[model samples]
Target: KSCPNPGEIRNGQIDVPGGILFGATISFSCNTGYKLFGSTSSFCLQWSDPLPECREIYCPAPPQIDNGIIQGERDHYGYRQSVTYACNKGFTMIGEHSIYCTVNNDEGEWSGPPPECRG
Candidate 1:
């Protein structure tokens, strides 16, 4: 029985240190700004159990800012993607103009609070 990881997990890699057989163990991890989903470790039990898999972790969509719009609109944003906010006509930005979709401890994070667009 071989415990194999299903293909590739976005922004992550699997480590199968030893032979894929009964009692064999495997590990999972993600890149610098990405998180790992699903089981982190799995063991082979004589082919009696289903194979383990790692899922790709993605950051939530950037919140909409009032009177402002994102440079390039996207429904879903991945980790480490940069987003710039621009105010509509007659409005001014009142905070960081740009935010980064970062990963902290396998979770999504914004560089700072959303900026405000004020007249």
Candidate 2:
């Protein structure tokens, strides 16, 4: 049985290694900063695992300061971005005012001394 058309993918590519007809095949790969998930290569069989996703490398918001907030807020931070934090009045900052998003060992997170607001 022929499989459905394995169309385009955002931040990724779909190589129709072969025809979409019965027994044909397809392959998927992601662009830099995005990881591929699911089967990379599969052949037609009337059915197959759903197409993969090109999940971008991203970090969560920097952890909240004990007594402060960040200048800009985000639901999620892209790889290598940074955030600026300001300690609330009457509290002294105990760490750098800015930290950057980084990937260490393929894990996304903020790096540098954790921002702290000490009274």
Candidate 3:
């Protein structure tokens, strides 16, 4: 048992030998570039780990589109925050028009690739 998408069990029964059960103690680590936001170790209870979760690291800034601007402008974006793109005049929006910040194994990711504003 582990967090959603930010951590993975390491050095435990469920990992090495492929056998996990109650009272099992395991350690977890955030993926590269990500920081641990919750307890590093968790105990396997009757059902699963009682405490396991991870938070997203702050992102510097959303990528800049060649001929588009980001809606809801901000200096930085956090997990789950979203931005919409609108192409400038004479440019056509391509790909996903909106992107949301997401956490993947402790790293920040976008829901979709950056939209392009093709002329």
Candidate 4:
């Protein structure tokens, strides 16, 4: 039997490129900055395994910098969202001044090391 379209996932796509047949192949992929959770490719066995979800990658809170503060803080930072750091008047910044939420091997990550303040 031919498999019906499984529908598209949010911020992602479902491909029945080979056409849906008993053993036809289908694939899934997320937009840039998103990560897919679950099976990425499946073959039709009438319905195939459960589909995957493309979740917006989220990073933990911006690290607190001694003698410095973070700008653009959010309760939940989504992919590509950025935060900037600033050193207090008497402290100097060391390393990157800004960091953004990113994905690594399908996991949430922050771009670059957090900046620190130095006198």
The best candidate by TM-score is 4
lDDT of 2 by residue, 29-74 (tens): 8776577877887677764666788888787667776789889687
Pairs in clash, predicted candidate 1 = none
TM-score of 4: 0.84
- Residue-level lDDT for 106 in candidate 4: 74
| lDDT of each residue in 1-119, candidate 4, tens digit only | 78877877898988877788887888989997788899988788866677899887778777787898987677988778898999999999989889988878777788888898999
Backbone clashes in model 4:
0
**lDDT tens readout by residue for model 1, 3-116:** 544355556776778766778766677767555556776666743333344444457777888799989877666666778899999998998988887766667776677789
Model 2: residues with Cα > 4 Å off, grouped in runs: 1-9, 13-29, 40-52, 104-106
Report lDDT (CA) for all predictions.
0.70, 0.78, 0.63, 0.84
Q: Judge candidate 3 against the unseen true structure and give its global Cα lDDT, from 0 to 1.
A: 0.63
Window of ten residues with lowest summed lDDT in model 3: 10-19
Q: After TM-score superposition, what is the CA distance of residue 80 in candidate 3 from its true location, in Å?
A: 1.4
Task: Please tell me which model should have the higher TM-score, number 3 or number 4.
Answer: 4
Candidate 2, residue 85: lDDT: 87
TM per prediction: 0.64, 0.57, 0.53, 0.84
Query: What order do you get sorting by TM-score, best first?
Result: 4, 1, 2, 3
Return the lDDT, model 4, position 100: 88
**Shift of residue 100 alpha carbon in model 2, Å:** 1.9
